[PDB]
Design a protein around this ligand. Sequence first.
Ligand SMILES: OC[C@H]1O[C@@H](O[C@H]2[C@H](O)[C@@H](O)[C@H](O)O[C@@H]2CO)[C@H](O)[C@@H](O)[C@@H]1O
Length: 178
Amino acid sequence: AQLCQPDAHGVRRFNGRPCASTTRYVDGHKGACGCGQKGSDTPFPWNLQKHVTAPSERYFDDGGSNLWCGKNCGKCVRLTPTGGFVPGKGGAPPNHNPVVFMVTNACPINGNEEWCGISGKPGTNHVNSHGYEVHFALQDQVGQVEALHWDNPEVTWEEVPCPGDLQANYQQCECHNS
Ligand SMILES: OC[C@H]1O[C@@H](O[C@H]2[C@H](O)[C@@H](O)[C@H](O)O[C@@H]2CO)[C@H](O)[C@@H](O)[C@@H]1O
């Protein structure tokens, strides 16, 4: 079911492009980029509703271990389904429309070994237990991922400029300009 094949260094890729694994998550926290009012664990509603993600830790902080205002807070990633998935842990989505998600939170290694246990940032050939160099946990509090019918799809991933509405949202996060 995984369509991204490991390269000579173990990193799963699809027609050269790097792949990522995905999951859904819900937890109601403000999150590691400070996207809510300062000092309170209350996310702005948009950060529960939009296409936002908690990437695995080493991408979140560009190789570091900071779980507050990681270096990649506010970046956006375009995720494109390959049609693949990890057997027993996902399925094939109905279409392969790409979706852009903004980084507003972190998936720490601690307590997320299977998917987020990756010991180096992309570029360094470290992978999770399924062979991907990065993992994106996708916020699903209001069913925004369920609505895509994404059941942990395998994707190719790249950083892209954020759409204007997400850039404006990110400007009220506390980690904007740290
Ligand atoms: O919620 C504010 C709080 O977020 C912390 O990041 C957590 C996040 O809350 C949780 O949803 C996610 O799954 O894990 C990360 C990392 O544990 C952040 O680390 C705190 O500094 C921040 O105050």
